[model samples]
Target: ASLTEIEHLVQSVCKSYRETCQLRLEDLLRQRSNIFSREEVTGYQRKSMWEMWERCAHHLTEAIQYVVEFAKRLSGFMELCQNDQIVLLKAGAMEVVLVRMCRAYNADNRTVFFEGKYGGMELFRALGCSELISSIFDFSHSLSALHFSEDEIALYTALVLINAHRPGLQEKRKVEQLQYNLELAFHHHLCKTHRQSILAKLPPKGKLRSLCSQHVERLQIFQHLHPIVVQAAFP
Candidate 1:
C-alpha cells in the first residue's frame, strides 16, 4: 500500500530521531550525574540543569517534529496519489509535495518538542497572559522534582498494555469504548498542546484554521527547528 509506504517513511524518520535523541540523552544524563552532591541528587544549580534540559528537550523536539511531519506529508502524498482528476503535471508535483512536506514535518517536530518542553517549564510558574521564560523554567524545575503518582503510573501502564494488543485504537468498537478512547486521546493530546504557550505566540500564518490545523503546523514547526526531519525522512 502507498499509504503503508508513507507510514514506513514516517517510522524510518522516527527511528532515526529516537536513536539520535537517545545518544544526546545519554550525554545529558552523564553531564547531569556529575552535578549531584551533598546528599541532594541535584544542587538545583539552575544553569547546569537548564542546559541539560535544553539538550534533552532539543533532541526530543526533533523526534516529535518528525512524527508530526510524517503525518502531514503522508496526508498530502496520499491525497495526490489517490486523486483521479490530477494531470501528469500534477502527478509530477506529487513527489515534490511529498518530499517537501515530509522534510518540513521532521524538522518542525524537533524544534517544537524542545520549545514546547522549554515553554512548558516556563508556563508552569505563572498562568497569566504574559510570563517570563525564567518563571516558566522555574515551573519546569518544580515539575522535575515531582515523582509520578502511583495511580498515574498504574494508569499509564494499563494504557500501554491495552494499546499493545489492540490495533492502535484504529478499529471500530462499542460506542462507549470509542468515546472513552477518543476522550483519553483528546485529553492526552491537548495536555501536550496546553504545555506549549510559545507556539501560541507564534501562530501559524494562514487564514483562520482549526486546532487541527494548528496542530499540523505545530508539527511542521518542529521539523523546521530540527533539520533532522529532512535527513531522516529521505536519507
Candidate 2:
C-alpha cells in the first residue's frame, strides 16, 4: 500500500481507539479541575513534538500485539522469521536494544505527560513510530549510550522515509531532506559543534575536546541505565 493509505488506516484505527480511551478516563477526571486549559491541550496535541511522541506509544503497543497475533496466524513466529541460531541471536540483540530505547523514551517523558490532563491514546500513537527517528542522532554525546550501527541507522531511516513519503508531501522539509540530503536535525543541540554551514557557531575546541572525548566506549558504561525511573502512574 502507499504511504498515504497506510497512514490513513493508522489514523483511522487510532481515532477509533482514542474515543474508547477518553470514555474510559472516567473517575480519573471526574474530580479533577481544569488544570489544563483548552489552548494548552490543543497546542500540546497539535504542535508539541514531545506530546506527539508521548501519545504515539499507545499505537506501538497495539502494533506489537498485532505482530503477536500475526505470528500465531502464520503457524507461530519460530516458523516464520528465525530459521537459524545466528538469526535468532541477532533478533534477540535487536529487541534488547529497542526495548532499552523504549524504556528510555518512556521514562524520560511519561511523567510530565500522564500527570497533566491528557489521554494515553495520543502518547501511544507517537511511540508507535518507525525506529529510524533515533538513527538521525549522532552518538557523540549524552546519547552515546544508545548505539546504532551505520547500516542499522540507514535501514531505519529508509523505513521512515519509505513509510512517510507521498505525493503532496514533496514540499515537506523532512520529506525533502530525507530523499536527497544527508542533513539531520535530530541533534540541534550539537549543531554548533558539528559546525553546520547555516548555524555553525564557534568552531569546536579542536584537539582539546577530542583528547578527552569518550569515543564509542561510552556505551558500555551506560548499559545498566533504566529508561524510566518508575512505571506509568496511569492505567
Candidate 3:
C-alpha cells in the first residue's frame, strides 16, 4: 500500500491545493488589485506594491498548509516525534513548493498564475527585485517543460520531505530509514513506468535550494520595502 497510498495522498493534496488556490485567486482577482494594472512603474508610491506583497504572502502561506498535510500522511512521518517532524517540514517545505510551481505555471506564455492572472516577470515590476521573480519564473519554466507527472512529483516531494540531511535534525537513523525506503519506493516507481531516463536528470532540486537562498534575501528586501504589509500577514 506504500505506493498507492503515497500516490493517493499526494494527488489528494494537489487537488485540494488547486481548488484552494482557485478560490483565493478568484477572490483576489475580482478586486483587480492595483499593482499590475497601475502605471506599470510610477504608480501611487508604496501602496500598490504593498497590496501585491500581501497577496503574495497570503498565497505562499496557503501553499505551506498543504505541505504540512503531505508530511503527516507519509507512513513514518509521525514516528519522527514532534520536533524532528517540524525540522523536516521546515527544511523541505520551500523546495517542495518550487516543485509544486509547475502546477501554476504557463509554459507557453512564460507567465506565473499569480493573483488569478497570467503575469510575466514584468508583472512584479514594483518589487524592485525582479531578479528573484525572474529566477522563480525560470525554474518554473524548466520544471513545467519537463512535464513530470503527478506521481513522480509526488515521489520527488517524498524524497525531498523525508530528507535526513538537514542541519537541525536529531535522530539521523530514523529519518534516514524513512528516506531510504522512500527512495526505493521512488526508484521502483520510476522504472515500472518507463521513466528511468529521468532517474538523474529530473527537474534538479539543487537549484531550488539556490533559489530559496535568493528568495530569502529578496524577501527581506521586500519586507523592508513595506514592513506594514509584512505585519498585515500576521494576527
Candidate 4:
C-alpha cells in the first residue's frame, strides 16, 4: 500500500532530519577523543566526568530541538489537542531518540557516545546504571543488524510519535488510528524489504513494540541515574 499524504509528509520531514541534522556518535567520538586520554580512563577526575555530562546535555538539547521541530512539521501532530501533544512528546520523544541513534552505538566495543563523551560500560557503572545500559546496547545492536533504510527510519520515527497510548487525550481514537495506519505502512515496507530470509522471521509489529517498551524503560533509568542530564536536556 502507498503512503497517505500525512504519512508521506512525516516521512519527508524525518528523512530531511536524518539526512542533514542528525548527529552520529562515531563522528563525534573521532573528533573529541583527543580531549580525553585513554590512560586517564582508570583515574578520571569527578569534575571531568561532570564536564562530559555537560557535553552530553548539550548534544541532547540539540537532539530534542530537532525532534520538536520534526513534530511541529508533521501534518497531524499539532492538530491534536495541546495537552495530547505534550503527552505524546513526553511519552515518545526519548524512544524516538534512542531508536534513531541506535546506529551510532557500537555494541562490539561496548561503547556509546552520549552527549559528547565516548563512554564505555564502565562509565555507566560509575553512574550506578546497570541493566539500562546493557539493554540499550542490545537493542541498538539488534536494530543496527537490521540495517534500516532512511525510509524505514522515517516511518519508524513517525510511528513512535503516534504510538503512545497515554491518558487524557481529547482525540485518542484519532491518534490511535493514525498509529495503526502508520504501522500498516511500515509493515508494507517491511514485507518488501525482508520477505525471504532469517530476518523475515522477526515480525515488525512485535519487534517495534518490544523496542518501544525498552526505550521507555531505559529513559527512566537514565533519567534517574543522571538527573542532571535530563534537567539540562529538557530544561
Candidate 5:
C-alpha cells in the first residue's frame, strides 16, 4: 500500500501548485470581456458573440499552457523524449482542461461557471454546439456528484497524461510502468473510501477512461468549430 505512496505524495504537492493555475483561464476570460456586459449588448448580438469567442479562444490557449506546465512538473513526465512529451501534451491538453472545468461546474444549475458566471453554456450553444455541450454538461453533472478530493483529481490527471496509446513515446514501457504504479496507488486509495453509494455510477476501474473519452470527443467537436469560432472571435 505504501509502495507508491511517495509517488502519490509528490503528485499531491504538484497538484497544489497546478491548482493555483485553475483560475487563470477564467480570470483571463473575465478580463477580456470586462468592458462589455452580456446584458448590455442585447442589440449587438454579433459583436457580443464575437467577444465571447475571442475570450473563449484565449482561455483555451491559456488552459493548454497550464496543462503543459503541469505536465512538466510531474515526477517522470519530463524524462520522456521531447517528441513523446509533445505527443502526450497534445493528446491530453483538452482532457486536462475538462478536468479543471468540471471542478467549476455547478451541477445543481446544470451550467458551467467561468469566473463565477453562467455565460459558458450560452457561448457553447451560440457556437452551434447545443448537442455536444449538453452532453458534456450531463457528463459533468455525473462527475460532480463524485466530489473528488484534490488528491483524486491530481492522480487521475496523471493517469490521463501518462497514457501509453499516445504515439511517438520512445520509452513506452517505462511510461506504462509509471501509469500502472499511479493507478495502483489511486485504486488503493479509492478503495479505502466509504462513499460507494454516492460513487455507484463511477466505478473506479472505468470512470477515468470514460471521462477522458468524453472530453476527447467534445474536443473533436470543438476542432470542427474552431475555424468559425476564430473567425468570429477575431473579426
Candidate 6:
C-alpha cells in the first residue's frame, strides 16, 4: 500500500479536476443541437466559427493547465530538470488532454461533450478540421471502451506524463527512472486481465502524436482561427 502511494495521489488530483470539467446536465441540454428548434442549430452552426474556436481553445488551455498542475503533483515530478519539465509539458500536455477527453466522450450518442453541449463531427464542420476531431473521437471511443476506473485513468495519465523520449530533455535517465516507477505502479495496481491492456494500449502515443500534429496543421491552415492559448502553449 505504502509504495504505491503515488497512484493514489494522482488519482485524487485527476478526480478533483475532472469533476470541474465533467458535463453538467443543464449545460448539456441548453446547447444540445436537438434541444433547440432544428432551425437554431442550422443558424448557429452556420455562423461564428471564430467564436467557437476561441471558446474551445480557451477551454483546452485551462485543461492543459490542469494537466501541468497534475504533473507537478505527481511524486518526484518537480525534481525533474527544469528544461526537461518544459520539454515534457510542451510535448505531452495535449496528449494528456486528449486522454482526459475520454471522460466527456458520449458513447451512446456518438458525440463528445463540447463547450456546453454534446456534438462532434457535424457541429464542428465549419471549423474544417473534421479529420482532427474524428481522430479524437476514435481515440476516445477506443479508450473509453475499456471503461477505466478513475484510479486506472490517473495512473495511466501519470505514465503518459513520465515519458523519457521527449527530444531536448536534459536528464533523460532521471525522467526514465520516474517513468519506470509509474510503469511499476501500473503493474502493482492490477493483474494480467487488464494488465496487457495497460501495457498495450496506454497513451496510444502515435495516435496522440498524430492528433497533436494534426491540430497544429489545422492551426496553420486556419491562421485567422488562431487560438492564442493553443498557439502559445507549444514549441
Best by TM-score: 6
Q: Tens digits of per-residue lDDT for model 6 on 82-151? A: 7788777777777777877777676666777664556656777667667777877888888777776666
Model 3, 100-178: lDDT tens per residue?
A: 7776676765656665455567766766667787888888887777777766777787788787788778898999987
What lDDT, from 0 to 1, does candidate 1 have? 0.30
How do the residues 1-235 of candidate 2 rate in per-residue lDDT, one tens digit apiece? 3445434433432343333232233343342332445565555556554545434444334433332322222111233222231222222222322321221222122211244442223332232333333331221222223333222232222222221233333334543433232223223212433423322321132321232222112222433211111112111
Q: Which lDDT tens digits does candidate 1 get at residues 83-174?
A: 22122111222122221221111121121113222112222222121333333233323323333222222222222222212232223243
Model 1 residue 11 CA deviation in Å: 18
Which ranges in model 3 have alpha carbons more than 4 Å from their true place? 1-47, 221-235
Worst 10 residues of 4 by lDDT: 225-234
Q: List TM-score per model, in order.
A: 0.24, 0.20, 0.75, 0.68, 0.70, 0.78
lDDT (tens digit, per residue) of candidate 4 on 1-235: 3456545654565565565347643475474443334654554433354554455555655676677666766657868887788777766666667777665665556566644555565554444446755766777777767766666766777777786476667788889877777677666666666733423533364555565565445445443332223434334
Off by over 4 Å in 2: 1-48, 76-235
Q: Candidate 1 at 188: error in angstroms?
A: 15
Better lDDT candidate (2, 5): 5
Q: What would the TM-score be for candidate 6 when compared with the true structure? A: 0.78
Clashing pairs in 5: none
lDDT of each: 0.30, 0.30, 0.66, 0.60, 0.60, 0.68
lDDT of 5 by residue, 29-68 (tens): 4443333246633422444444555566667766666666
Candidate 3 shows a clash count of: 0
Better of 2 and 4 by TM-score: 4
Clashing pairs in 4: 56-115
> Could you tell me the lDDT of residue 220 within candidate 1?
52
lDDT of 5 at 179: 78
Question: What's the C-alpha lDDT at position 224 in model 3?
Answer: 41
RMSD of each: 15.4, 17.4, 5.7, 5.3, 6.6, 4.3
Task: Name the regions of candidate 4 deviating beyond 4 angstroms.
Answer: 1-16, 19-21, 24-37, 43-58, 115-118, 192-235
